[PDB]
Ligand SMILES: OC[C@H]1O[C@@H](O[C@@H]2[C@@H](O)[C@H](O)O[C@H](CO)[C@H]2O)[C@H](O)[C@@H](O)[C@@H]1O
């Protein structure tokens with residue numbers, strides 16, 4: 001066979017002969033392919049190749065595209081490594097009124113080029129090593145080699161030379177304001193402040209000219225926060241400690257809900273006595289959550305301005321952040337003041353819904369929709385309908401989770417395949433370049449895990465490894481593997497340091513990598529929490545908890561700017577739709593209207609969505625701005641998503657809008673998402689808004705000693721919600737002294 005058996009399921013090991021289903025569209029057909037054959041990595045990098053990284057273009061392009069190892073941007077070329085910093089004069093905020101788009105971006109310039117004395121014509125740049133957030137790029141020309149070590153959160157670039165020495169080349173002569181022989185402080189013609197470091201005795205030459213040279217086979221470059229010799233002296237201390245290892249280790253304390261992450265480097269000395277450590281540049285989502293024991297390592301005045309706001313300097317081997325996991329739910333409970341017969345009707349209406357495509361994404365949206373309806377059907381006493389939805393889920397997954405047909409041949413569609421070259425599970429039919437660019441695996445597979453988590457909630461037997469569980473856990477491994485996974489790189493999607501996932505597998509853009517729907521990422525993480533809890537997989541659960549909680553911290557900074565500190569004042573919208581390494585867009589990957597540029601970071605609504613309601617002033621600010629722009633509450637598209645979002649702070653208003661318009665159209669209509677977004681239903685919309693109306697506001701100030709919970713607060717009156725996935729009753733302690741007993745396989749309140 002060209003298939004590997006996993007419990008009752010299987011994946012392909014040879015590329016299937018695709019069933020194109022008579023579709024001739026060149027786009028659709030090109031989608032049904034594989035990621036690039038050529039990987040630019042040396043023979044030192046073996047095993048499943050890392051993807052979905054800030055540095056991906058180094059691996060995919062012969063050289064690289066523009067990359068953002070903050071505070072720097074860099075790019076590999078035949079001539080060497082171009083180095084740049086966006087100063088305020090490089091930054092712009094542009095609006096296209098007719099498109100309804102905004103762009104915050106810098107420039108693709110060159111402050112200087114780091115060069116090798118022996119060649120300006122390297123053949124390629126390869127990935128020679130990487131760790132949790134640094135990369136080692138190797139520019140290669142036979143005996144001539146230049147190895148560049150750099151990373152997000154590193155104000156150093158470390159440069160190692162073979163068969164040559166260091167050259168720094170400038171278009172306009174820099175100002176060398178400090179000359180210590182082997183160490184120089186310099187500024188570009190336009191006043192960007194840098195430093196360069198060589199070992200003692202290896203003195204810089206060409207001071208005053210456009211080309212600075214050093215005979216050493218090792219230099220470091222630093223971005224300096226200020227033209228300041230005291231800072232230069234501090235940067236000297238770690239300029240010879242090249243980062244070799246970097247690890248973000250975490251723990252989840254289930255009793256308190258605290259997610260603790262330690263970021264640790266291990267360096268190699270390039271001069272005698274070089275300390276084992278570095279100067280880290282911390283992002284807002286890190287330093288705003290800095291542990292007490294790390295506070296003394298801060299270099300208070302060491303600030304860098306970047307697209308994500310202000311970075312700050314911290315010195316040493318490690319630092320720690322502390323975050324609070326807020327819980328998730330399998331769905332909202334039965335606590336609304338809805339008309340029950342009206343909800344039952346909408347539940348039956350949803351039997352008309354069908355997927356709007358055969359690809360993993362459209363099919364994903366559909367199964368997430370069914371998985372969302374089934375607990376509501378249970379709650380309304382419609383157990384036979386709930387079972388129909390779960391049966392349809394089972395039928396869909398039992399199809400997709402087998403790579404072979406009844407005769408034992410590979411299927412042409414509705415299957416998964418292991419690309420060995422990169423080491424990734426791909427689904428066919430594919431879309432959004434999920435296969436050709438290894439894009440969005442969390443977005444797509446998150447919907448599959450949702451379907452499986454809802455099945456598992458009602459049927460533990462189905463979810464066992466030897467049954468359909470093994471294939472689900474394989475999908476999960478693809479997008480969030482642990483270390484030393486034989487088939488997959490570590491935490492594919494996630495960048496533990498930038499604190500968010502990256503959607504593009506290749507990152508071949510001059511803006512670095514990107515993420516549009518942070519909510520579909522949070523959806524993926526929620527679903528792994530639910531799945532792992534249902535199936536008794538503690539290690540997997542805690543990993544998804546760490547991801548959910550960390551991703552949340554990046555979202556509130558860089559998507560939402562809840563603290564009003566990151567977006568430039570002149571930027572009109574109250575959200576960034578797509579975050580890049582180097583820029584921020586109020587824009588979508590498809591041609592869209594006004595609502596979608598907000599709501600793509602809200603959808604889908606589910607039992608893990610309550611994170612969206614932690615900052616009520618933000619929810620109001622964002623809503624009101626979209627309302628201002630629309631000019632009324634007549635939403636251009638996806639009205640139901642707006643109402644559901646509005647319910648976080650004002651469910652009376654959400655109810656009123658809903659009552660006025662929910663029944664404007666009848667049954668599922670793919671051509672019309674004015675009222676109901678195609679991944680959503682009337683039943684979901686109606687259930688959510690009424691639940692929020694009775695419960696009040698999300699209360700993130702209360703934690704619990706178990707992971708599957710929520711706490712709401714209505715005018716000082718708290719409602720506590722727990723779902724118990726266990727065969728035994730549990731007792732849950734909340735952080736405000738409240739405690740509750742929960743029966744097996746049930747909610748504490750609102751089971752229906
Ligand atoms: O990059 C991640 C996102 O990619 C999007 O597809 C892009 C195409 O629309 C565009 O024409 O080409 C680029 C490659 O140059 C594609 O990456 C997907 O639609 C998104 O779903 C995805 O997150």
Ligand SMILES: OC[C@H]1O[C@@H](O[C@@H]2[C@@H](O)[C@H](O)O[C@H](CO)[C@H]2O)[C@H](O)[C@@H](O)[C@@H]1O
Pocket residue numbers: 365589590600603673679
């Ligand atoms: O409403 C029809 C339009 O929908 C678009 O799909 C969006 C996806 O591209 C994006 O990845 O996710 C959102 C939310 O699920 C979808 O609305 C299509 O791209 C458009 O071609 C289509 O006109």
